[PDB]
Design a protein around this ligand. Structure first.
Ligand SMILES: C=C1/C(=C\C=C2/CCC[C@]3(C)[C@@H]([C@H](C)C/C=C/C(C)(C)O)CC[C@@H]23)[C@H](O)[C@@H](O)C[C@@H]1O
Ligand SMILES: C=C1/C(=C\C=C2/CCC[C@]3(C)[C@@H]([C@H](C)C/C=C/C(C)(C)O)CC[C@@H]23)[C@H](O)[C@@H](O)C[C@@H]1O
Lengths: 10, 239, 239, 10
């Protein structure tokens, strides 16, 4: 879950 | 009394963080699905989604944010993202027009524009009053970015694990803000209390937005107009 | 030999279904995130998402589709949606330009436009050759819509439960198509075999698209540019 | 799951 947030958070 | 070297380094990095993540030309806006005058939900969904990416970028440059755990970083952003967008939007807000002006009449948003994105005066009235009272504060950019960082670094949010660490970070930012106002803001004896009141108002605005966002997210013909990032950040999934 | 009353009623409803769901003015396209020349992924994501909504509308008007179970309706659409978009896009395709022209140079898509949406010549070469060979068939609108309905109503797709019912529906549509071509299409003795070959080519195109779509969907900086409907239909969730 | 498809399929 939160796939995009993890990517954006580096 | 004056500000320490470490206190102004915090201010330096926070100011740079905001300049790098707030583009005063608004030229990126022509990439959003166009406004239409729920006529306005596609455009405002794209606007908010773009703004979330900038808030994540700003957050990442707050001293100490990136050293928090991934979950705490997510927790703080899922709870505070809409508040920081409300705070950061004050930069485009005009007292004269009572609306947000983003370089072009196509990207000028009045209250009625936001009703065509599925929201009601129960949210839009306090929001506009929030913006006007915040604009009347005439904050220095230093104070504006400190308040965004303080808002973001609130430990009293659902999902946060390291209460102690987040509070210490927020404590240092509040110290900076109080000192900055006393030394650098002529006539600001009452300013710090007013700014902390605005943080209270944002919680109320957040609460009301979450309520009205549930209506959107529960009707698939509206939720399909949102973006995947908006669905994630404003959604109810917990890590 | 001639066509029966029931056979032409099928043709009638399928033609009406397509006219109601394919807008030759393409005026809705100004609502998509604009094209940019993965520069083109926002625009093509919106294009495909819009086209999926039209395929669902077309499907709902195919005789007997709406009487299938919700799961079978989902199964058939998740497996065939990209194929029907490929078939229906032939209407905007030009032999002269080798591209798809949708009422305006902004909405004229060449092969290089689609490479800027994350795809490769491994998909785009067979796709363009598919379109040109399909355009050379010079299908009557009757034949075009019958082929879309036949493609949609294939029982040999993952997830389908009522194999027997879907096949009977597809059988009747094939009967209609074979009879229409023999009676109404001068010189079409070889046409039905060619059209069934095109259905084979679509499976190959589908396979390659699914492969390249996995790359997009696994990189969050690209998948975040997609729409919630595209994520659903092209995603791997099973009912 | 398939929330939008269900809604679109009526
Ligand atoms: C976003 C920013 C700007 C304006 C902000 C605004 C004005 C439009 C309406 C807005 C988005 C509110 C509305 C409740 C949100 C609804 C969201 C969904 C429909 C998903 O519920 C909240 C803030 C409001 C400016 O463009 C500029 O200052 C950059 C800044 O970041
Ligand atoms: C959609 C339609 C039309 C053109 C279709 C096209 C031309 C552009 C590229 C396209 C979408 C292909 C590409 C592989 C898809 C990628 C999708 C993601 C990036 C998600 O993988 C597939 C078909 C292709 C016309 O506008 C008109 O005929 C209406 C019709 O419905």
């Amino acid at each position: 879950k939160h796939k995009i947030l993890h990517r954006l958070l580096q | 009394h004056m500000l320490s070297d470490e206190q102004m380094q915090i201010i330096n990095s926070l100011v740079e963080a905001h300049h790098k993540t707030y583009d005063d030309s608004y030229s990126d806006f022509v990439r959003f699905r166009p406004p239409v005058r729920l006529s306005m939900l596609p455009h405002l969904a794209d606007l908010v989604s773009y703004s979330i990416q900038k808030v994540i970028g700003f957050a990442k440059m707050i001293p100490g944010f990136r050293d928090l755990t991934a979950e705490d970083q997510i927790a703080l952003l899922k709870s505070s993202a809409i508040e920081i967008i409300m705070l950061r939007s004050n930069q485009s807000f005009s007292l004269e027009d009572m609306s947000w002006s983003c370089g072009g009449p196509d990207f000028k948003y009045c209250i009625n524009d936001v009703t065509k994105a599925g929201h009601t005066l129960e949210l839009l009235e306090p929001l506009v009053k929030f913006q006007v009272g915040l604009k009347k504060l005439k904050l220095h950019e230093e104070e504006h970015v400190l308040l965004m960082a303080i808002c973001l670094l609130s430990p009293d949010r659902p999902g946060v694990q390291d209460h102690v660490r987040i509070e210490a970070l927020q404590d240092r930012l509040c110290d900076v803000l109080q000192a900055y106002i006393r030394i650098q803001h002529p006539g600001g004896r009452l300013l710090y209390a007013k700014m902390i009141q605005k943080l209270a108002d944002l919680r109320s605005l957040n609460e009301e937005h979450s309520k009205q966002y549930r209506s959107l997210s529960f009707q698939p013909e509206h939720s399909m107009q949102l973006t995947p990032l908006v669905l994630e950040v404003f959604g109810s999934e917990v890590s």
